[PDB]
């Protein structure tokens, strides 16, 4: 009865999608597809994160306006997401008019509720560029440990936090020039007004993964502070109402893009839904954000406080994932492991990576390692050599000898029913984001199917007097077992699933449809459904990434 709204983190419009970021997008897409295959009403949206100084820097580097820069990168991101089967219902932009309006609405409601303060602050200013400098565009000497080259917010060597004005001998990263100190009025969101609210919110059952417990404990012990939400002109972003020449910091309007992408989606595709159905405080529907562990603070503290302050509902849960390593090391251009999503697609089948990720993904916030030799072996053994070969080895006889038509009865009803009944556990694993468990359970079923075929030996039956019906019965069971496997893998391998729908002539492929055992059922001529992963193609991708 409850409908679900799901998002992925919004990528910045300042560069391409890389293979490491695909982990969370593929995780979310698998979940959405599996939940839909189980009959849930799931809406799935994303958008480009379009604002901020970093995006202005890229635009100028590329000789174009910010508006043309974000238009270019949005098309690139959509291209890459689509290439990996990450299919959103809608892909928008934080620059949209819908997001401008909702940003103003949330700000003004918070301002009138008492959650906004304005005050003059001392800020570093680049005199060459005529720009006030935010913390990530200032470097200097940490006042505590005296280490060079630290940004304006905190030191990586000793961990001290500070205002950028406490750095010794600072520099602007925009020009290298020495900044000067000036005054600028800044707008602050009064996050401390929500300390007790968030201490309860972050600990509600299902809101956050259990591992984030200690990380939040640190955060609440350290104490919440007013959040600086304004940026001075020049800034590519939304102007703050009644604050001339002041803009919302990109992170204010970025999560609002979740609302606005959804809002623009339902305006064309779900006339049965309205915005309040998901975002009014009395909503009975669910909202989930898939996000990396590096942005949990924005999503677990800033975001629900801003929503609560504006009388909107808050996310039901944050699904948090770790990072991807490659061959047991951080991804580097020098090792050719900082791989653009576009480069992978120029050399390899995307469903290789969907499967490999699924076989390792769990509900835990952990880093996943992509060992490239293991990637080749795992995908080839599991999919090409085991799962797809079950169809091949059974279809061989049905296509060649039995007019492409499965037997009129199921000769192993209990065995097939046992594969059907295993769907309940597989569905529960997908829903719990325990993808590695779902894959293991499916592969255990594939082993049982090969065990059955090996026991019956259709190749021997085809060479024995009078066993024609038994060859057909056995191969028909094998195809039915394969069909169950492909239904269960469909959230992970949607293209393979479409191909199996064509091969088995099946219009429906959701979980309910699997209860229909195929009998007297014409199938198409079998053709290979997946090529093996070629190690040279993997190496060509690595070499193209150096
Ligand atoms: C509202 S999610 C925004 C995520 C941000 N663009 C990032 O890359 O970290
Ligand atoms: Na995980
Ligand atoms: Zn330090």
Burial class (CB in 10 A: 0-12, 13-18, 19+), 421: exposed
Q: Answer with the one of 362, 386, 410 that is the final residue of a domain.
A: 386
In sequence order, what E strands does 161-316 have? Answer: 168-172, 180-189, 227-228, 230-232, 246-248, 286-292
Q: Are strands 180-189 and 227-228 parallel, antiparallel or unpaired?
A: antiparallel
Coil/strand/helix, residue 305: helix
Compute and round to an integer the Cα radius of gyration of the chain. 27
Q: How far apart are CA 36 and CA 511, in angstroms?
A: 9
Within 38-65, residue ranges assigned H as helices are 53-61
Within 283-368, residue ranges assigned H as helices are 296-297, 303-309, 341-345, 350-360
The H or E element spanning position 211 is none
Coil/strand/helix, residue 409: coil
Q: Tell whether ligand 1 has an atom less than 6 A from the beta carbon of residue 12.
A: yes
Q: Domain range holding 164?
A: 138-172
Same domain for 216 and 90: yes
Q: Are strands 116-126 and 368-370 parallel, antiparallel or unpaired?
A: unpaired
Q: How far apart are CA 387 and CA 418, in angstroms?
A: 17
DSSP class of residue 208 equals S
Q: How far apart are CA 413 and CA 421, in angstroms?
A: 12
Same domain for 353 and 424: no
The angle, 0 to 180 degrees and rounded to 10, between the axes of the packed helices 468-489 and 413-421 is 0
Q: How far apart are CA 58 and CA 241, in angstroms?
A: 27
CB-CB contact of 154 with 162 (8 Å): yes
Q: How many domains does the chain have?
A: 3
Please state the length of the chain.
546
443 φψ region: left (φ > 0), alpha (ψ -120 to 50), beta (else): alpha
CA distances from 469 to 461, 475, 478 (A): 9, 10, 14
With a CB cutoff of 8 Å and minimum separation 6, the contacts of 461 are 467, 470, 471, 474
202 inside domain = yes
Same domain for 312 and 406: no
Residue among 59, 55, 68 at smallest CA distance from 12: 55
Q: Distance from CA of residue 16 to its chain's centroid?
A: 15
CB-CB contact of 322 with 367 (8 Å): yes
Give the CA angle between residues 526, 531, 535 to the nearest 5°: 165
Q: How far apart are CA 242 and CA 240, in angstroms?
A: 6
Residue with tokens 């060459």: 128
Residue with tokens 């698998």: 30
DSSP class of residue 165 equals G
DSSP class of residue 464 equals S
CB-CB contact of 91 with 261 (8 Å): yes
Same domain for 332 and 307: yes
How many other CB atoms are found less than 10 A from the CB of residue 362? 16
The H or E element spanning position 43 is strand 42-48
Coil/strand/helix, residue 188: strand
Sign of the CA dihedral 377, 379, 384, 390?
positive
Q: How far apart are CA 48 and CA 93, in angstroms?
A: 5
* Residue from 6, 8, 11 to probe ligand 1 pocket by mutation (most atoms less than 8 Å from CB): 11
Residue with tokens 């325990």: 434
CA distances from 251 to 122, 156, 169, 294, 325 (A): 21, 22, 28, 13, 27
* Cis peptide preceding 234, ω within 30 of 0: yes
Residue among 116, 351, 59, 388 at smallest CA distance from 246: 116
Residue 361 tokens, joined:
């993904």
541 inside domain = no
Same domain for 98 and 79: yes
Residue among 407, 475, 189, 133 at smallest CA distance from 310: 189
Same domain for 476 and 500: yes
Q: How far apart are CA 533 and CA 370, in angstroms?
A: 14
Residue among 359, 361, 360, 342 at smallest CA distance from 350: 342
364 inside domain = yes
Q: Tell whether ligand 1 has an atom less than 6 A from the beta carbon of residue 253.
A: no
Q: How far apart are CA 364 and CA 164, in angstroms?
A: 35
Q: Is residue 142 marked as binding?
A: yes
Residue 183 tokens, joined:
């005054």
536 inside domain = no
CA distances from 329 to 17, 109, 282, 323, 377 (A): 19, 46, 46, 11, 20
Q: How far apart are CA 146 and CA 167, in angstroms?
A: 9
CB-CB contact of 333 with 546 (8 Å): yes
Residue with tokens 């150096």: 546
Method of structure determination: X-ray
Q: Tell whether ligand 1 has an atom less than 6 A from the beta carbon of residue 52.
A: no
Ligand 1 atom having least distance to the Cα of 11: 6
Torsion of CA 276, 280, 283, 289, to 10 degrees: 90
Give the CA angle between residues 441, 458, 404 to the nearest 5°: 90
Q: Tell whether ligand 1 has an atom less than 6 A from the beta carbon of residue 49.
A: yes
Q: How far apart are CA 247 and CA 186, in angstroms?
A: 10
Q: How far apart are CA 54 and CA 150, in angstroms?
A: 18
Residue 327 tokens, joined:
């061959």
Coil/strand/helix, residue 312: strand
Within 457-534, residue ranges assigned H as helices are 458-461, 468-489, 494-504
CA distances from 206 to 4, 117, 288 (A): 15, 33, 11
Residue 438 tokens, joined:
């779902």
With a CB cutoff of 8 Å and minimum separation 6, the contacts of 2 are 284, 285, 286
Ligand 1 atom having least distance to the Cα of 291: 2
* Residue from 6, 10, 299 to probe ligand 1 pocket by mutation (most atoms less than 8 Å from CB): 10
Which residues, by Cβ under 5 Å, contact ligand 3, an ion?
Answer: 142, 144-145, 147, 155, 157-158, 160
Q: Distance from CA of residue 293 to its chain's centroid?
A: 12
How many other CB atoms are found less than 10 A from the CB of residue 109? 16
In sequence order, what E strands does 144-236 have? Answer: 150-151, 168-172, 180-189, 227-228, 230-232
Q: Distance from CA of residue 531 to its chain's centroid?
A: 26
Same domain for 143 and 115: no
Same domain for 73 and 16: yes
With a CB cutoff of 8 Å and minimum separation 6, the contacts of 186 are 118, 119, 120, 121, 123, 228, 230
537 inside domain = no
Q: Is residue 394 marked as binding?
A: no
169 φψ region: left (φ > 0), alpha (ψ -120 to 50), beta (else): left
Half-sphere exposure of 109 (CA within 13 A, CB side): 14
CB-CB contact of 441 with 419 (8 Å): no
Q: Tell whether ligand 1 has an atom less than 6 A from the beta carbon of residue 24.
A: no
Residue among 367, 355, 364, 382 at smallest CA distance from 326: 367
Q: How far apart are CA 426 and CA 11, in angstroms?
A: 31
How many other CB atoms are found less than 10 A from the CB of residue 276? 12
Residue 491 tokens, joined:
């959230």
Q: What is the resolution of this structure in A?
A: 1.9
533 inside domain = no
With a CB cutoff of 8 Å and minimum separation 6, the contacts of 356 are 370, 375, 378, 379
What CATH number corresponds to the domain at position 148? 2.20.28.20
In sequence order, what E strands does 202-316 have? Answer: 227-228, 230-232, 246-248, 286-292
Residue among 419, 395, 417, 393 at smallest CA distance from 406: 395
Residue 52 tokens, joined:
């901020």
Same domain for 250 and 230: yes
What CATH number corresponds to the domain at position 7? 3.40.50.620
Residue among 99, 95, 77 at smallest CA distance from 22: 77
Q: Answer with the one of 147, 172, 197 that is the final residue of a domain.
A: 172
- DSSP per residue, 414-440: HHHHHHHHTHHHHHHHHHTT-HHHHHH
Same domain for 179 and 153: no
Torsion of CA 136, 138, 144, 145, to 10 degrees: 90
Residue 319 tokens, joined:
């699904």
Give the CA angle between residues 82, 388, 371 to the nearest 5°: 60
Same domain for 295 and 166: no
Q: Distance from CA of residue 104 to its chain's centroid?
A: 28
Residue with tokens 């508006």: 67
544 inside domain = no
81 inside domain = yes
What CATH number corresponds to the domain at position 499? 1.10.730.10
Same domain for 275 and 238: yes
In sequence order, what E strands does 54-213 have? Answer: 90-93, 116-126, 131-132, 138-141, 150-151, 168-172, 180-189
CB-CB contact of 51 with 88 (8 Å): no
The H or E element spanning position 40 is none
Ligand 1 atom having least distance to the Cα of 254: 1
Residue with tokens 């038509």: 405
- Burial letters for 285-316: b for 16+ Cβ neighbours within 10 Å, e otherwise? bbbbbbbbbebbebbbbbbbbbbbbbebbbbb
Q: Tell whether ligand 1 has an atom less than 6 A from the beta carbon of residue 376.
A: no
Residue among 486, 488, 491 at smallest CA distance from 530: 486
Q: Answer with the one of 386, 402, 425 that is the final residue of a domain.
A: 386
């Amino acid at each position: 009865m409850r409908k679900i709204l799901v998002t992925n983190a919004l990528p910045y419009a300042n560069g391409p999608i890389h293979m490491g970021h695909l982990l969370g997008y593929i995780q979310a897409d698998i979940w959405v597809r599996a939940m839909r295959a189980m009959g849930h009403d799931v809406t799935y949206v994303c958008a480009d994160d379009a604002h901020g100084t970093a995006i202005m820097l890229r635009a100028e580097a590329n000789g174009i306006s910010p508006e043309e820069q974000i238009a270019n990168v949005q098309k690139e991101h959509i291209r890459d997401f689509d290439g990996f089967g990450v299919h959103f219902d809608h892909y928008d932009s934080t620059h949209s008019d819908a997001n401008k309006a909702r940003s103003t609405d949330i700000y003004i409601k918070n301002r009138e509720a008492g959650n906004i303060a304005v005050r003059p602050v001392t800020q570093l200013f680049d005199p060459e560029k005529g720009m006030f400098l935010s913390d990530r565009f200032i470097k200097g000497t940490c006042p505590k440990c005296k280490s060079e080259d630290q940004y304006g917010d905190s030191c990586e060597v000793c961990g001290t936090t500070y205002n950028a004005t406490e750095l010794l001998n600072p520099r602007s990263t925009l020009s290298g020039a020495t900044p000067v100190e000036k005054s600028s009025d800044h707008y602050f969101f009064k996050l401390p007004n929500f300390a007790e609210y968030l201490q309860k919110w972050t600990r509600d059952e299902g809101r956050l993964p259990l591992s984030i417990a200690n990380k939040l404990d640190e955060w609440f012990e350290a104490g919440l502070a007013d959040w600086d939400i304004s940026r001075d002109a020049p800034y590519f972003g939304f102007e703050i109402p009644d604050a001339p020449n002041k803009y919302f910091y990109v992170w204010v309007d970025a999560p609002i893009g979740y609302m606005s992408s959804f809002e623009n989606y339902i305006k064309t595709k779900r006339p049965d839904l309205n915005f309040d159905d998901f975002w009014k405080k009395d909503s009975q529907n669910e909202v989930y954000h898939f996000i990396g562990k590096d942005i949990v603070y924005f999503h677990a503290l800033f975001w629900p406080a801003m929503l609560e302050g504006a009388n909107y509902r808050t996310p039901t849960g944050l699904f948090v994932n770790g990072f991807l390593t490659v061959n047991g090391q951080k991804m580097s251009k020098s090792r050719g492991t900082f791989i653009k999503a576009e480069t992978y697609l120029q050399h390899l089948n995307p469903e290789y990576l969907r499967y490999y990720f699924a076989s390792k993904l769990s509900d835990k916030v952990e880093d996943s390692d992509l060992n490239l030799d293991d990637f080749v072996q795992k995908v080839n053994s599991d999919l090409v050599g085991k799962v797809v070969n079950i169809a091949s080895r059974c279809a061989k006889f049905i296509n060649s000898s039995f007019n492409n038509t499965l037997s009129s009865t199921c000769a192993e009803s209990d065995l097939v029913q046992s594969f059907i009944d295993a769907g309940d556990s597989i569905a529960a694993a997908y829903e719990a984001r325990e993808f590695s468990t779902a894959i293991r359970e499916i592969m255990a079923l594939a082993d049982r199917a090969n065990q059955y075929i090996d026991e019956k030996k259709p190749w021997a039956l085809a060479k024995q007097e009078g066993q024609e019906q038994q060859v057909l019965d056995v191969c028909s069971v094998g195809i039915n077992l394969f069909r169950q496997l492909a239904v269960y893998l469909a959230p992970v391998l949607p293209t393979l699933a479409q191909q199996v729908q064509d091969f088995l002539k099946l219009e429906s492929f959701d979980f309910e449809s699997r209860k229909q055992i195929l009998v007297s059922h014409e199938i198409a001529q079998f053709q290979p459904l997946m090529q093996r992963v070629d190690p040279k193609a993997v190496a060509a991708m690595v070499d193209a990434s150096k």
